[PDB]
Subunit: 327 residues, 4 copies
């Protein structure tokens, strides 16, 4: 055992639509325990030292912020910041936790602000965040009164990052992060909304990825799809020979208009392109909490409209679609 | 879904020793749902109509009896008896439930009275009842303050019977009946005591059966083993060509002394023969709640010391043993 | 058993590089037998009535033609033509077999004439023809003195078509057609050359298709890849919402220049675009041996530069590449 | 690869009844290759140095003897005896190979002489020898003109012993030894006669063993069963607490009369007890070619009617039965 999913098993046991997941999940999480990880003992020691118990004040609507009415002992807060810094690098956020500003590489709040206007309201929806990161968005989803948020992300570190914020929220049992790939989920068809943001370009079969997403949605369930794109008509599809913005293991970068046809082919209805944004270096930068290289380093030093490799520079697109049938 | 094991999954999720069972159990129970059963929709309709919520008085120590301080409406009690009668045939008991006497084929209380004197105390033990029936014994095990009782029995009907009594106990979550064969359990090694009573003669590989039991016990954990036997030394082993007391799918009937060597060979310690009883027709008979044939039908009409087939008549033996190692508790 | 692969099992048993295929193939072929097919009993009856034993003259170099020095009885030849016609529709060819011209829908000879100029010599190579059809090309591959030809094609009919020509070649054991999808092959890395012609647009994951091909090649082994394309730079990739030329289960149509980058990304070396051809209605037409609809039906009746659906009309591209490493031969 | 079963795969490919075995056999033999063995490289080096090519004269009818009309060079024969001695210990035989007498621990010829009188003639039968040893009996089975003999035995050494004699028979392709347990065979129902001699007492589920045998027989196929027994009626079944004649991992020793009921229960017809023999120290002894301990050592030093452990001394029984249906 690295980490005990006892409470998740309990949740999905008592869910009519998720119980069938127990037929495959526990053997996968058992095998994940046994693929031991160098840094997980250390990370755990730190997560255990993080103050237990509820905060007084929580805002997950306009931000992800945690405070107490009584200011917390300046000894315990210097220790907390120290603990949280053990989980470097901090890519998705930002978080303000008892007045510690976790300035994450990404302004993941901005991406949320772009998405929210175009989704069906999350009030009482079950959501899947595919490639959820440390689960920043799952917190914002609960902010809009989602019933339940399930994140999946292979990163051991992003699990510890999430369990840290969760512990500091007093162990909120309405969000969970499972250390799985999307390819490991069976055809659950259990979720009202599914988010897949920043995953498609990492997946060697994009069509199979769109189908795997469709397979987690109930009838008339809603898909938010966010991915890096290029400009063009339905025939515009960049597949890089080598790297794109210093990433390796990346595959398809279709135009928003091609991706819209792809989603239709696979069987989605009401497919809408609702935003195209060109990632600025104010949205993605190196920080105090993520000290590695970031977008400035990945652009052409003399042309920010291009990647170092010469390809069109990062452009993110949001598409929203319905799976066929009624809700 | 015939029956939702939601609460069992919840229990074993939060147990250190049982959580690994989630790696194999749920796909088996899923497949059990999908092997449809003729009578289970009907049985369920009846189980749902049984009054839910706690009784005032429960005795699971000297019997299995349920009563309220407030008398029940004679309308509601005639309806209850009617509901409970739909779960015919009632083989293991007996139960007294709001003054309705379920006269079961078996005096399963008597077998309990024979066993209890020879076991380590159940106070705070986790127990596995292999071939538990409707779980009569699991109730008596909680009566002796067992922490947790898990029953294994393939019978769809014995599940309905159990969930009926459980509902009438106010949904006691300390006993559970899973519709599995012992052969379907992995090597859990999670149980303080394991009962296997009336199973060994049904199992084509007796030694594999003893090992499957040993594999559910923690270190120094205790096995109660009850089975039909014959008289003789350690080389006395009846394997019937025919049937034995009308039973069709039946294999080994060793002497208590042979079974004791078998248990030793397989690796058990402190193996003790603690009782041999010749099943009387007062212990196993036809009744108003089990109207089918029973032991008097299965004996020679001329000689009750023999089965109709001519073999020595039913003789049940209790053996108790320890799995190697020290028991921490 | 629909068809017994006894001889294939025998071949691959005695091959160093193919024997590991016995770990997975036979259970797949067993399951294929048990997925019964309406027409296969009939087709078999006809294949069995085709004269067995060697012809005197075989040309598999400039054509696929079979003749005898002794004229055949006009009784036996009318019967043969009748037998061969039961295997309608005949899509890949053409074949001339004891003077019977099988006018196949496709001039598959022409596609061969386009390919041969750009390949490393097949003399003594083991080849895999992925989506081989009735195996027309595997015959031409042996014509260039390939050591061994293995075809993969799910079509029950294309198997019957192949075994017919093979029987009429006197049971040539150097070509074989297995009724598999490419997705069913393990990572054999056993083949000098691999052909994939007319398959990529049928496959929902094109990159996984290119990798599955790379996985059948030995080091420095050669891939011929032929597929429908569009014009454009490396970002030109048609994925049709509708159908494309009446085809229903169809996915990626990249430009030859995009497909070349795709092959590079996946890890191929020396990737060359060696030909782009616009399928004429002289290369693909209805015939007396393929009486169904064909390309003229699938084009805009007003504009042969477009499909009925309005997309650019069929354009086939040949690419040739090397799998990394030195090729020992 | 330790050993290439290429020729066996070829045989069973072209057999109508054995081809289905290819659905499971090759993965098992692949896994057997990968469970490497300390001594198999060495044993192989020796097997490779054994003279190739046919002998002139072969008797597999009254013995297992190999000779040439021209006596073989006394240099090459001293080398052969040396090679064959590398395969110590030699338990089943005896063999006479170019005048080298392999005096095996067991007079396995005697056991054959006891069996032969009671079996249906092997002329053109396919046979399975379960726990075949080095395959001595499979040679005698071909002596009676069996069509094909398949032996199964987990012992790496007994495989090398067999391939040695086979090579010295000029690579006879009508007998084969697969390094499998009986439990590894599927329900082939492909064999005219099945021998199981000296296996039952080693098998923790005797009934499952009898069923596994029944499952390799065609309809009205014949089972020879040989095993150690005790005296008594159908209720006489010795299961030892510890060891029996120094063996561990031994289980049931029923009386011949109990075993006969067991065979009936499992579904065999025409079950016949055709011989009970008390193993003498002339049938099983230490030798020149098997220098380890043997039966004299396993008996009570002062009572040869008992094992060292005190149990009745070794007694072997032959039973013959038909699987239901016609041939
Ligand atoms: N097989 C896989 N299955 C699931 N996730 C995976 C897999 N492989 C990698 N990931 C995860 O995909 C995420 C990619 S970042 C998106 C985060 C957030 N949603 C965001 O939109 O800010 C993209 C970006 O912003 O560049 C990481 O968290 C990986 O672990
Ligand atoms: N594979 C199997 N696995 C588990 N149980 C099985 C299996 N096969 C049958 N059973 C069950 O074994 C029980 C046997 S009665 C013992 C009841 C109680 N304990 C009593 O001792 O009164 C025997 C007797 O009459 O004594 C039944 O409930 C079967 O469903
Ligand atoms: N999963 C699959 N795996 C393998 N083959 C498949 C699969 N699915 C379909 N096929 C087969 O792919 C072939 C396609 S035709 C190429 C014939 C010849 N090579 C030609 O180039 O003329 C295309 C064309 O018309 O050009 C058919 O024989 C299908 O059975
Ligand atoms: N699972 C198994 N499956 C098959 N064979 C096995 C297994 N385990 C062990 N064996 C084999 O069973 C044989 C036992 S000697 C019989 C030889 C010959 N038939 C004889 O009758 O002289 C018995 C004796 O004579 O004591 C050995 O060759 C083991 O490898």
């Amino acid at each position: 055992m690295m980490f005990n999913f006892a409470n998740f098993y309990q949740l999905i046991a008592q869910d009519t639509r998720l119980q069938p997941w127990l037929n495959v999940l526990p053997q996968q999480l058992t095998d994940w325990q046994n693929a031991e990880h160098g840094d997980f003992p250390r990370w755990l020691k730190a997560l255990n030292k993080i103050p237990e118990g509820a905060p007084d004040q929580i805002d997950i609507k306009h931000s992800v912020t945690i405070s107490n009415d009584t200011p917390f002992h300046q000894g315990e807060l210097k220790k907390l910041e120290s603990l949280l810094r053990t989980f470097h690098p901090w890519r998705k956020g930002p978080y303000t936790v008892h007045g510690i500003h976790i300035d994450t590489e990404w302004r993941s709040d901005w991406k949320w602000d772009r998405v929210l206007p175009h989704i069906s309201p999350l009030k009482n929806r079950s959501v899947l965040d595919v490639g959820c990161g440390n689960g920043y968005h799952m917190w914002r989803m609960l902010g809009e009164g989602a019933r339940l948020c399930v994140g999946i992300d292979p990163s051991h570190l992003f699990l510890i990052q999430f369990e840290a914020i969760r512990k500091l929220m007093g162990g909120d049992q309405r969000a969970h992060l499972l250390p799985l790939g999307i390819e490991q989920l069976p055809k659950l068809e259990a979720f009202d909304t599914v988010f897949s943001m920043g995953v498609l370009y990492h997946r060697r079969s994009p069509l199979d990825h769109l189908i795997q997403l469709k397979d987690q949605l109930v009838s008339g369930g809603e898909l938010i799809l966010e991915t890096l794109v290029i400009e063009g008509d339905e025939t515009a599809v960049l597949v890089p020979k080598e790297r794109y913005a210093q990433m390796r293991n990346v595959y398809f970068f279709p135009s928003a208009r091609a991706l819209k046809v792809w989603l239709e082919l696979v069987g989605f209805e009401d497919v809408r392109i609702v935003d195209e944004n060109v990632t600025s270096v104010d949205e993605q930068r190196t920080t105090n909490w993520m000290t590695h290289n970031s977008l400035p380093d990945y652009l052409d030093q003399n042309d920010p409209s291009k990647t170092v490799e010469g390809y069109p520079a990062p452009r993110r697109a949001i598409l929203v679609a319905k799976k066929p049938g009624h809700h």
